[PDB]
Structures are given as C-alpha cells and as structure tokens.
Amino acid sequence: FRGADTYSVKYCEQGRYEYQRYLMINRFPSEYKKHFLSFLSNIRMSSGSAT
C-alpha cells in the first residue's frame, strides 16, 4: 500500500515559517482587555523566587 510514494521538493526546500498565512483573529473588546491585563501582569511578575 503506497510503499513507494514521494512528495514535491517544495516540501523539503521551503524555508522556516514561509507557510504561515496572515489571518486576522477577531475577539471581543472584553477579551482584549482581559488578555492585555494578564500579559502586563505576567511581564511585571517579579523575578528571583520562581521567575
């Protein structure tokens, strides 16, 4: 069953992250606020203890 089967050379000669297509993800403004605040808190987490 398909013992000898090959694929294009584009697959093996593509660069990294060439295939990613630009799609605009949409989310609610409440989601925007929630995620922005969460990311800001995570950035501001103080180092030393476990970070």
Partner 1 sequence: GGPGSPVRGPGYYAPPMEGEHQRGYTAEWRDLRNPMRPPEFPTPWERKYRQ
Partner 2 sequence: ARKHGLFYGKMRFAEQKITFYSDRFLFRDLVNRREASYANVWEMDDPYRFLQTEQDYEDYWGDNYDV
Partner 3 sequence: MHPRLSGQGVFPRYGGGWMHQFGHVYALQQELLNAEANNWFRAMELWHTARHEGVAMNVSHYTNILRQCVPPTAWEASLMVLKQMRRENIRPDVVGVGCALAACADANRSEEVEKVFSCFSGKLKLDSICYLALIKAKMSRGGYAEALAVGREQDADGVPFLPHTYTHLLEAAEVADDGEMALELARRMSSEQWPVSDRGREALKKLSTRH
Partner RNA sequence: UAAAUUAUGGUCAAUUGUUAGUAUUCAUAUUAAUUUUUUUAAAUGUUUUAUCAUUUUAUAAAGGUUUAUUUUUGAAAGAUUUUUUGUAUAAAAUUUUAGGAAUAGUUAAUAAUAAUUUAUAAUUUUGAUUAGAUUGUUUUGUUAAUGCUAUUAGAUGGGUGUGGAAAAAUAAAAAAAA
User: Which C-beta is closer to partner 1: that of 14 or that of 38?
Assistant: 14
Interaction site with RNA (CB under 7 A): 34, 48-50
For 1-51, the DSSP string reads: ---S----HHHHH--TT-S---------HHHHHHHHHHHHHHHH--SSS--
CB of 17 vs RNA, minimal distance in Å: 27
The CA distance from 5 to 10, in Å, is: 15
Residues between 10 and 49 that touch partner 1 (CB under 8 A): 10-11, 13-15, 18-22
CB of 13 vs partner 3, minimal distance in Å: 4
